[PDB]
Amino acid sequence: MGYFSDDEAQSRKLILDHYEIPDNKISEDEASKLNDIYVSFNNRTASCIDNLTLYLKEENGIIVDVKFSGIGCAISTASTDIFCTMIKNKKVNDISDLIRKYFNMIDGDSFNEEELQYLSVFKNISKQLNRIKCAKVGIVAIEQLVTK
Ligand SMILES: [Zn+2]
């Protein structure tokens, strides 16, 4: 929220606006009536209230629609949503790349702000305590849904 740095306040509205107004977050009503072309994975962390179910739909090697649902914090609802908007018409390869490249930046290592884009606000969550699993919980669910 501060304004000494240039990134901080701009980076702390992307989280606030993808957590109070997520783009791809559905209701438990809306999820049950989804077409059975969607796959699902629920991942839960015990370090927060983050228990999210992801929904991906494949159309000839291209992920066409991604939605997520459930309970989550700002770090979980922003990381999932921002990730969801970006994997939105990409292929089942070049998503598995973002996931591990995102995880390496979450693990405090090399990242490309051109490849990770608005996931680069999470570039130093390994410095905030017990927030690493909050920024991995929803993307690990996507990870399973791309492989299995
Ligand atoms: Zn959390």
Tab-separated table of N, CA and C and ligand atoms in Angstrom:
chain	number	residue	atom	x	y	z
A	1	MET	N	0.843	-1.184	0.000
A	1	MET	CA	0.000	0.000	0.000
A	1	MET	C	0.880	1.236	0.000
A	2	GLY	N	2.180	1.018	0.182
A	2	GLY	CA	3.122	2.104	0.315
A	2	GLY	C	3.457	2.747	-1.011
A	3	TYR	N	4.147	3.887	-0.926
A	3	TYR	CA	4.507	4.602	-2.144
A	3	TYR	C	5.954	5.078	-2.173
A	4	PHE	N	6.835	4.535	-1.333
A	4	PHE	CA	8.265	4.693	-1.576
A	4	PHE	C	8.661	3.973	-2.856
A	5	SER	N	8.334	2.688	-2.936
A	5	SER	CA	8.620	1.895	-4.116
A	5	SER	C	7.575	2.159	-5.193
A	6	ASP	N	7.895	1.728	-6.408
A	6	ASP	CA	6.969	1.864	-7.523
A	6	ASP	C	6.068	0.651	-7.677
A	7	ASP	N	6.560	-0.531	-7.307
A	7	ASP	CA	5.817	-1.765	-7.524
A	7	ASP	C	4.749	-1.987	-6.461
A	8	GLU	N	5.021	-1.587	-5.216
A	8	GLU	CA	4.243	-2.071	-4.076
A	8	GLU	C	2.750	-1.776	-4.225
A	9	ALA	N	2.392	-0.503	-4.405
A	9	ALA	CA	0.979	-0.138	-4.439
A	9	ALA	C	0.295	-0.655	-5.699
A	10	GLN	N	0.973	-0.567	-6.847
A	10	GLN	CA	0.424	-1.136	-8.075
A	10	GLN	C	0.271	-2.646	-7.955
A	11	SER	N	1.200	-3.293	-7.255
A	11	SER	CA	1.127	-4.732	-7.052
A	11	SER	C	0.080	-5.122	-6.019
A	12	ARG	N	-0.296	-4.211	-5.119
A	12	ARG	CA	-1.274	-4.511	-4.081
A	12	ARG	C	-2.661	-3.959	-4.401
A	13	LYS	N	-2.927	-3.655	-5.669
A	13	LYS	CA	-4.284	-3.544	-6.185
A	13	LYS	C	-4.636	-4.675	-7.132
A	14	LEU	N	-3.638	-5.238	-7.818
A	14	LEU	CA	-3.854	-6.444	-8.607
A	14	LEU	C	-4.318	-7.598	-7.728
A	15	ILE	N	-3.756	-7.711	-6.521
A	15	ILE	CA	-4.190	-8.751	-5.591
A	15	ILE	C	-5.576	-8.430	-5.052
A	16	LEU	N	-5.789	-7.173	-4.665
A	16	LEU	CA	-7.055	-6.773	-4.064
A	16	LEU	C	-8.206	-6.839	-5.058
A	17	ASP	N	-7.933	-6.629	-6.346
A	17	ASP	CA	-8.993	-6.610	-7.344
A	17	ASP	C	-9.220	-7.961	-8.006
A	18	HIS	N	-8.325	-8.926	-7.808
A	18	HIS	CA	-8.546	-10.297	-8.243
A	18	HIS	C	-8.956	-11.205	-7.093
A	19	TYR	N	-9.263	-10.621	-5.939
A	19	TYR	CA	-9.710	-11.332	-4.752
A	19	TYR	C	-11.068	-10.869	-4.261
A	20	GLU	N	-11.387	-9.587	-4.422
A	20	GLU	CA	-12.732	-9.092	-4.173
A	20	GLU	C	-13.598	-9.203	-5.419
A	21	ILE	N	-13.001	-9.042	-6.597
A	21	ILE	CA	-13.695	-9.251	-7.865
A	21	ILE	C	-12.858	-10.204	-8.714
A	22	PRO	N	-12.879	-11.507	-8.437
A	22	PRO	CA	-12.222	-12.454	-9.341
A	22	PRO	C	-12.975	-12.558	-10.658
A	23	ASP	N	-12.209	-12.745	-11.733
A	23	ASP	CA	-12.804	-12.846	-13.062
A	23	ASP	C	-13.371	-14.235	-13.326
A	24	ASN	N	-12.613	-15.288	-13.007
A	24	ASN	CA	-13.003	-16.649	-13.355
A	24	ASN	C	-13.490	-17.459	-12.155
A	25	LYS	N	-13.990	-16.805	-11.111
A	25	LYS	CA	-14.484	-17.524	-9.945
A	25	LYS	C	-15.986	-17.743	-10.076
A	26	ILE	N	-16.403	-19.001	-9.981
A	26	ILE	CA	-17.797	-19.379	-10.149
A	26	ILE	C	-18.393	-19.723	-8.786
A	27	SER	N	-19.711	-19.876	-8.764
A	27	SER	CA	-20.382	-20.323	-7.560
A	27	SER	C	-20.414	-21.848	-7.520
A	28	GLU	N	-20.742	-22.389	-6.347
A	28	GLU	CA	-21.006	-23.817	-6.271
A	28	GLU	C	-22.294	-24.176	-6.995
A	29	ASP	N	-23.205	-23.215	-7.156
A	29	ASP	CA	-24.348	-23.423	-8.035
A	29	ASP	C	-23.891	-23.529	-9.481
A	30	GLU	N	-23.101	-22.555	-9.939
A	30	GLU	CA	-22.683	-22.505	-11.336
A	30	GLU	C	-21.744	-23.653	-11.704
A	31	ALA	N	-21.020	-24.204	-10.727
A	31	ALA	CA	-20.069	-25.274	-11.021
A	31	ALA	C	-20.779	-26.598	-11.268
A	32	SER	N	-21.826	-26.881	-10.491
A	32	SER	CA	-22.540	-28.145	-10.623
A	32	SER	C	-23.219	-28.274	-11.980
A	33	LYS	N	-23.654	-27.158	-12.564
A	33	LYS	CA	-24.344	-27.160	-13.845
A	33	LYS	C	-23.393	-26.978	-15.020
A	34	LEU	N	-22.089	-27.083	-14.788
A	34	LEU	CA	-21.144	-27.042	-15.891
A	34	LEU	C	-21.270	-28.298	-16.742
A	35	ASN	N	-20.944	-28.155	-18.023
A	35	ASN	CA	-20.926	-29.307	-18.910
A	35	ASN	C	-19.912	-30.321	-18.405
A	36	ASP	N	-20.239	-31.604	-18.535
A	36	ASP	CA	-19.327	-32.639	-18.075
A	36	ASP	C	-18.116	-32.798	-18.980
A	37	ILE	N	-17.849	-31.798	-19.825
A	37	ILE	CA	-16.584	-31.726	-20.545
A	37	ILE	C	-15.481	-31.151	-19.675
A	38	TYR	N	-15.838	-30.575	-18.531
A	38	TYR	CA	-14.863	-29.995	-17.623
A	38	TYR	C	-14.245	-31.070	-16.739
A	39	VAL	N	-12.964	-30.900	-16.440
A	39	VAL	CA	-12.281	-31.704	-15.448
A	39	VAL	C	-12.174	-30.875	-14.177
A	40	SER	N	-11.890	-31.543	-13.062
A	40	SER	CA	-11.925	-30.891	-11.763
A	40	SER	C	-10.818	-31.428	-10.871
A	41	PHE	N	-10.271	-30.549	-10.035
A	41	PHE	CA	-9.338	-30.951	-8.991
A	41	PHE	C	-9.474	-29.983	-7.830
A	42	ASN	N	-9.616	-30.527	-6.626
A	42	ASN	CA	-9.704	-29.740	-5.404
A	42	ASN	C	-8.422	-29.934	-4.608
A	43	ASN	N	-7.731	-28.835	-4.323
A	43	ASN	CA	-6.536	-28.857	-3.493
A	43	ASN	C	-6.760	-27.980	-2.271
A	44	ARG	N	-6.334	-28.481	-1.117
A	44	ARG	CA	-6.542	-27.808	0.154
A	44	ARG	C	-5.210	-27.660	0.870
A	45	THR	N	-4.985	-26.489	1.454
A	45	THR	CA	-3.839	-26.269	2.318
A	45	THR	C	-4.313	-26.165	3.762
A	46	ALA	N	-3.456	-26.592	4.682
A	46	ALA	CA	-3.749	-26.508	6.103
A	46	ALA	C	-3.090	-25.306	6.759
A	47	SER	N	-2.406	-24.471	5.984
A	47	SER	CA	-1.777	-23.265	6.493
A	47	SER	C	-2.660	-22.036	6.347
A	48	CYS	N	-3.805	-22.166	5.688
A	48	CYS	CA	-4.742	-21.066	5.505
A	48	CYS	C	-6.127	-21.677	5.299
A	49	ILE	N	-7.065	-20.871	4.800
A	49	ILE	CA	-8.424	-21.336	4.541
A	49	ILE	C	-8.587	-21.648	3.061
A	50	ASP	N	-7.469	-21.856	2.367
A	50	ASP	CA	-7.473	-22.019	0.914
A	50	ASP	C	-7.852	-23.456	0.573
A	51	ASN	N	-9.088	-23.648	0.117
A	51	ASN	CA	-9.562	-24.931	-0.397
A	51	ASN	C	-10.328	-24.623	-1.678
A	52	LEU	N	-9.685	-24.847	-2.818
A	52	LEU	CA	-10.209	-24.435	-4.111
A	52	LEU	C	-10.375	-25.631	-5.036
A	53	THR	N	-11.425	-25.595	-5.849
A	53	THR	CA	-11.641	-26.575	-6.903
A	53	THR	C	-11.480	-25.882	-8.249
A	54	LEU	N	-10.608	-26.426	-9.090
A	54	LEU	CA	-10.351	-25.873	-10.410
A	54	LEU	C	-11.159	-26.618	-11.465
A	55	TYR	N	-11.396	-25.938	-12.586
A	55	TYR	CA	-12.178	-26.492	-13.685
A	55	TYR	C	-11.531	-26.090	-14.998
A	56	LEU	N	-11.069	-27.078	-15.760
A	56	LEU	CA	-10.484	-26.849	-17.071
A	56	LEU	C	-11.253	-27.626	-18.130
A	57	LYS	N	-11.301	-27.055	-19.331
A	57	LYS	CA	-11.996	-27.640	-20.470
A	57	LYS	C	-11.066	-27.624	-21.671
A	58	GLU	N	-10.843	-28.793	-22.266
A	58	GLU	CA	-9.917	-28.944	-23.379
A	58	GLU	C	-10.680	-29.084	-24.688
A	59	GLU	N	-10.171	-28.426	-25.732
A	59	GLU	CA	-10.755	-28.502	-27.074
A	59	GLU	C	-9.599	-28.633	-28.069
A	60	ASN	N	-9.214	-29.881	-28.350
A	60	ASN	CA	-8.134	-30.208	-29.284
A	60	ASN	C	-6.819	-29.553	-28.860
A	61	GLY	N	-6.327	-29.976	-27.698
A	61	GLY	CA	-5.054	-29.495	-27.207
A	61	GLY	C	-5.019	-28.047	-26.779
A	62	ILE	N	-6.161	-27.362	-26.745
A	62	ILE	CA	-6.234	-25.966	-26.330
A	62	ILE	C	-7.181	-25.867	-25.143
A	63	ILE	N	-6.714	-25.261	-24.055
A	63	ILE	CA	-7.589	-25.000	-22.915
A	63	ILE	C	-8.456	-23.798	-23.266
A	64	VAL	N	-9.763	-24.002	-23.351
A	64	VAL	CA	-10.659	-22.968	-23.864
A	64	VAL	C	-11.291	-22.163	-22.739
A	65	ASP	N	-11.711	-22.829	-21.670
A	65	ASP	CA	-12.304	-22.151	-20.532
A	65	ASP	C	-11.683	-22.682	-19.252
A	66	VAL	N	-11.351	-21.768	-18.344
A	66	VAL	CA	-10.855	-22.118	-17.020
A	66	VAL	C	-11.669	-21.349	-15.992
A	67	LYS	N	-12.173	-22.062	-14.988
A	67	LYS	CA	-12.868	-21.457	-13.863
A	67	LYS	C	-12.373	-22.110	-12.578
A	68	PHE	N	-12.519	-21.383	-11.471
A	68	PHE	CA	-12.149	-21.885	-10.155
A	68	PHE	C	-13.234	-21.504	-9.159
A	69	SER	N	-13.293	-22.257	-8.064
A	69	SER	CA	-14.307	-22.043	-7.042
A	69	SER	C	-13.727	-22.408	-5.684
A	70	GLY	N	-14.449	-22.027	-4.631
A	70	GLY	CA	-14.081	-22.409	-3.280
A	70	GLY	C	-13.596	-21.287	-2.391
A	71	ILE	N	-12.993	-21.640	-1.259
A	71	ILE	CA	-12.508	-20.663	-0.290
A	71	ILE	C	-11.044	-20.369	-0.578
A	72	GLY	N	-10.625	-19.134	-0.332
A	72	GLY	CA	-9.245	-18.765	-0.579
A	72	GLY	C	-8.957	-17.364	-0.110
A	73	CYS	N	-7.676	-17.104	0.133
A	73	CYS	CA	-7.223	-15.783	0.515
A	73	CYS	C	-6.906	-14.963	-0.734
A	74	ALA	N	-6.396	-13.752	-0.514
A	74	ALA	CA	-6.031	-12.887	-1.629
A	74	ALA	C	-4.897	-13.487	-2.449
A	75	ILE	N	-3.916	-14.102	-1.784
A	75	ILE	CA	-2.798	-14.702	-2.501
A	75	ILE	C	-3.261	-15.916	-3.292
A	76	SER	N	-4.270	-16.629	-2.794
A	76	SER	CA	-4.774	-17.793	-3.513
A	76	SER	C	-5.747	-17.395	-4.615
A	77	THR	N	-6.611	-16.413	-4.353
A	77	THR	CA	-7.619	-16.045	-5.340
A	77	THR	C	-7.033	-15.188	-6.458
A	78	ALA	N	-5.954	-14.452	-6.179
A	78	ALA	CA	-5.279	-13.692	-7.228
A	78	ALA	C	-4.374	-14.585	-8.066
A	79	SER	N	-3.562	-15.418	-7.413
A	79	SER	CA	-2.671	-16.309	-8.151
A	79	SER	C	-3.453	-17.243	-9.064
A	80	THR	N	-4.576	-17.781	-8.583
A	80	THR	CA	-5.371	-18.667	-9.424
A	80	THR	C	-6.019	-17.896	-10.565
A	81	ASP	N	-6.644	-16.759	-10.253
A	81	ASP	CA	-7.387	-16.016	-11.265
A	81	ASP	C	-6.459	-15.463	-12.338
A	82	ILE	N	-5.409	-14.748	-11.924
A	82	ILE	CA	-4.449	-14.223	-12.890
A	82	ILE	C	-3.882	-15.351	-13.743
A	83	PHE	N	-3.600	-16.498	-13.123
A	83	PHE	CA	-3.160	-17.667	-13.879
A	83	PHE	C	-4.254	-18.153	-14.822
A	84	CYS	N	-5.510	-18.140	-14.358
A	84	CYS	CA	-6.630	-18.603	-15.175
A	84	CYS	C	-6.833	-17.730	-16.406
A	85	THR	N	-6.705	-16.408	-16.258
A	85	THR	CA	-6.919	-15.522	-17.401
A	85	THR	C	-5.827	-15.684	-18.449
A	86	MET	N	-4.645	-16.143	-18.043
A	86	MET	CA	-3.504	-16.219	-18.944
A	86	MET	C	-3.413	-17.544	-19.681
A	87	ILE	N	-3.896	-18.625	-19.077
A	87	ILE	CA	-3.879	-19.945	-19.696
A	87	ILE	C	-5.167	-20.146	-20.489
A	88	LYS	N	-5.828	-19.038	-20.840
A	88	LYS	CA	-7.234	-19.021	-21.239
A	88	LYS	C	-7.494	-19.554	-22.645
A	89	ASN	N	-6.580	-19.343	-23.592
A	89	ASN	CA	-6.725	-19.935	-24.917
A	89	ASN	C	-5.429	-20.585	-25.371
A	90	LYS	N	-4.511	-20.794	-24.438
A	90	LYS	CA	-3.240	-21.421	-24.732
A	90	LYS	C	-3.402	-22.937	-24.765
A	91	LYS	N	-2.315	-23.624	-25.090
A	91	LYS	CA	-2.346	-25.056	-25.320
A	91	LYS	C	-1.886	-25.814	-24.078
A	92	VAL	N	-2.092	-27.133	-24.105
A	92	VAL	CA	-1.774	-27.963	-22.943
A	92	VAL	C	-0.275	-28.103	-22.751
A	93	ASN	N	0.519	-27.778	-23.764
A	93	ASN	CA	1.895	-27.367	-23.557
A	93	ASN	C	1.969	-25.850	-23.694
A	94	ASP	N	2.937	-25.266	-22.998
A	94	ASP	CA	3.115	-23.844	-22.715
A	94	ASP	C	2.269	-23.438	-21.517
A	95	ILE	N	1.445	-24.325	-20.969
A	95	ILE	CA	0.863	-24.105	-19.650
A	95	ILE	C	1.702	-24.783	-18.578
A	96	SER	N	2.048	-26.053	-18.807
A	96	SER	CA	2.952	-26.772	-17.915
A	96	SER	C	4.278	-26.039	-17.735
A	97	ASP	N	4.671	-25.218	-18.712
A	97	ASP	CA	5.874	-24.405	-18.562
A	97	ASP	C	5.647	-23.277	-17.566
A	98	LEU	N	4.576	-22.503	-17.769
A	98	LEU	CA	4.261	-21.409	-16.857
A	98	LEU	C	4.189	-21.893	-15.417
A	99	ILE	N	3.629	-23.086	-15.205
A	99	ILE	CA	3.425	-23.598	-13.851
A	99	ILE	C	4.759	-23.766	-13.137
A	100	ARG	N	5.709	-24.439	-13.782
A	100	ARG	CA	7.005	-24.644	-13.150
A	100	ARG	C	7.851	-23.377	-13.153
A	101	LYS	N	7.718	-22.533	-14.180
A	101	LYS	CA	8.410	-21.248	-14.165
A	101	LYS	C	7.851	-20.342	-13.076
A	102	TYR	N	6.529	-20.364	-12.886
A	102	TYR	CA	5.916	-19.638	-11.778
A	102	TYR	C	6.400	-20.189	-10.441
A	103	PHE	N	6.486	-21.518	-10.329
A	103	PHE	CA	6.919	-22.141	-9.081
A	103	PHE	C	8.376	-21.831	-8.762
A	104	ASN	N	9.217	-21.657	-9.784
A	104	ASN	CA	10.609	-21.300	-9.532
A	104	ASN	C	10.738	-19.859	-9.056
A	105	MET	N	9.900	-18.962	-9.576
A	105	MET	CA	9.863	-17.599	-9.065
A	105	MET	C	9.273	-17.562	-7.664
A	106	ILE	N	8.246	-18.379	-7.412
A	106	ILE	CA	7.705	-18.497	-6.062
A	106	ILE	C	8.759	-19.068	-5.127
A	107	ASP	N	9.609	-19.960	-5.636
A	107	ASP	CA	10.724	-20.511	-4.880
A	107	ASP	C	11.962	-19.618	-4.913
A	108	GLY	N	11.813	-18.364	-5.335
A	108	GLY	CA	12.873	-17.384	-5.206
A	108	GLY	C	13.994	-17.514	-6.209
A	109	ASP	N	13.678	-17.855	-7.453
A	109	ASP	CA	14.673	-18.083	-8.486
A	109	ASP	C	14.215	-17.411	-9.772
A	110	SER	N	14.949	-17.683	-10.849
A	110	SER	CA	14.839	-16.898	-12.071
A	110	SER	C	13.421	-16.890	-12.628
A	111	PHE	N	12.996	-15.717	-13.085
A	111	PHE	CA	11.709	-15.552	-13.735
A	111	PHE	C	11.854	-14.514	-14.836
A	112	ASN	N	10.981	-14.609	-15.829
A	112	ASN	CA	10.927	-13.644	-16.919
A	112	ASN	C	9.620	-12.872	-16.781
A	113	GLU	N	9.723	-11.574	-16.479
A	113	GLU	CA	8.530	-10.745	-16.334
A	113	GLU	C	7.731	-10.658	-17.628
A	114	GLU	N	8.346	-10.970	-18.770
A	114	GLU	CA	7.592	-11.042	-20.014
A	114	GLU	C	6.807	-12.345	-20.128
A	115	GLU	N	7.337	-13.445	-19.588
A	115	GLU	CA	6.611	-14.711	-19.635
A	115	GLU	C	5.597	-14.833	-18.502
A	116	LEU	N	5.975	-14.441	-17.283
A	116	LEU	CA	5.073	-14.601	-16.148
A	116	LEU	C	4.096	-13.440	-16.015
A	117	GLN	N	4.470	-12.256	-16.502
A	117	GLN	CA	3.573	-11.100	-16.626
A	117	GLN	C	3.046	-10.712	-15.254
A	118	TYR	N	1.734	-10.657	-15.038
A	118	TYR	CA	1.159	-10.238	-13.768
A	118	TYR	C	1.312	-11.277	-12.667
A	119	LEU	N	1.941	-12.417	-12.948
A	119	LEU	CA	2.349	-13.314	-11.880
A	119	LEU	C	3.635	-12.853	-11.223
A	120	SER	N	4.292	-11.853	-11.805
A	120	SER	CA	5.522	-11.300	-11.263
A	120	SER	C	5.291	-10.425	-10.039
A	121	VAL	N	4.036	-10.135	-9.686
A	121	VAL	CA	3.782	-9.491	-8.404
A	121	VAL	C	4.020	-10.463	-7.258
A	122	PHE	N	3.929	-11.765	-7.527
A	122	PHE	CA	4.218	-12.808	-6.558
A	122	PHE	C	5.694	-13.180	-6.524
A	123	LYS	N	6.573	-12.325	-7.055
A	123	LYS	CA	7.971	-12.703	-7.235
A	123	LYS	C	8.697	-12.923	-5.917
A	124	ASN	N	8.192	-12.361	-4.821
A	124	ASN	CA	8.795	-12.519	-3.503
A	124	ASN	C	7.690	-12.791	-2.485
A	125	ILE	N	7.086	-13.969	-2.611
A	125	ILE	CA	6.201	-14.474	-1.575
A	125	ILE	C	6.963	-15.378	-0.615
A	126	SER	N	8.072	-15.975	-1.061
A	126	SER	CA	8.981	-16.738	-0.213
A	126	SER	C	9.612	-15.896	0.886
A	127	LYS	N	9.415	-14.579	0.858
A	127	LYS	CA	9.835	-13.711	1.945
A	127	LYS	C	8.716	-13.432	2.936
A	128	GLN	N	7.466	-13.473	2.482
A	128	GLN	CA	6.327	-13.472	3.386
A	128	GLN	C	6.116	-14.876	3.937
A	129	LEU	N	5.859	-14.965	5.237
A	129	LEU	CA	5.772	-16.263	5.889
A	129	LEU	C	4.437	-16.938	5.607
A	130	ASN	N	4.474	-18.275	5.564
A	130	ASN	CA	3.325	-19.143	5.305
A	130	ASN	C	2.393	-18.585	4.235
A	131	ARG	N	2.966	-17.994	3.189
A	131	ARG	CA	2.216	-17.552	2.026
A	131	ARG	C	2.615	-18.302	0.764
A	132	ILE	N	3.638	-19.159	0.840
A	132	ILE	CA	4.103	-19.900	-0.329
A	132	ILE	C	3.055	-20.915	-0.764
A	133	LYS	N	2.449	-21.611	0.198
A	133	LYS	CA	1.395	-22.566	-0.127
A	133	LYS	C	0.111	-21.875	-0.558
A	134	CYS	N	-0.048	-20.596	-0.219
A	134	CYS	CA	-1.209	-19.839	-0.666
A	134	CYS	C	-1.108	-19.465	-2.138
A	135	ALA	N	0.112	-19.291	-2.645
A	135	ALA	CA	0.369	-18.952	-4.037
A	135	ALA	C	0.719	-20.170	-4.883
A	136	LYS	N	0.666	-21.368	-4.298
A	136	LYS	CA	0.869	-22.615	-5.022
A	136	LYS	C	-0.367	-23.502	-5.039
A	137	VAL	N	-1.361	-23.227	-4.192
A	137	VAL	CA	-2.443	-24.183	-3.973
A	137	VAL	C	-3.318	-24.307	-5.220
A	138	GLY	N	-3.707	-23.173	-5.807
A	138	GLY	CA	-4.576	-23.188	-6.972
A	138	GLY	C	-3.891	-23.557	-8.270
A	139	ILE	N	-2.581	-23.334	-8.367
A	139	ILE	CA	-1.842	-23.677	-9.576
A	139	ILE	C	-1.360	-25.128	-9.547
A	140	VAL	N	-1.208	-25.720	-8.359
A	140	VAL	CA	-0.964	-27.157	-8.274
A	140	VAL	C	-2.198	-27.928	-8.730
A	141	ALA	N	-3.393	-27.417	-8.425
A	141	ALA	CA	-4.617	-28.034	-8.930
A	141	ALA	C	-4.665	-27.997	-10.451
A	142	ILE	N	-4.293	-26.862	-11.047
A	142	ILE	CA	-4.192	-26.783	-12.500
A	142	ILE	C	-3.148	-27.767	-13.007
A	143	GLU	N	-2.037	-27.895	-12.280
A	143	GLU	CA	-0.952	-28.777	-12.694
A	143	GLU	C	-1.442	-30.209	-12.873
A	144	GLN	N	-2.214	-30.709	-11.905
A	144	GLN	CA	-2.772	-32.053	-12.021
A	144	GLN	C	-3.695	-32.162	-13.227
A	145	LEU	N	-4.544	-31.152	-13.428
A	145	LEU	CA	-5.535	-31.206	-14.497
A	145	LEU	C	-4.911	-31.124	-15.883
A	146	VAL	N	-3.668	-30.666	-15.992
A	146	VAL	CA	-2.988	-30.675	-17.282
A	146	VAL	C	-2.293	-32.012	-17.537
A	147	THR	N	-1.765	-32.652	-16.493
A	147	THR	CA	-1.112	-33.943	-16.672
A	147	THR	C	-2.120	-35.085	-16.611
A	148	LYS	N	-2.927	-35.126	-15.557
A	148	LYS	CA	-3.902	-36.194	-15.374
A	148	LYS	C	-5.327	-35.658	-15.423
B	1	ZN	ZN	-4.039	-18.573	2.043
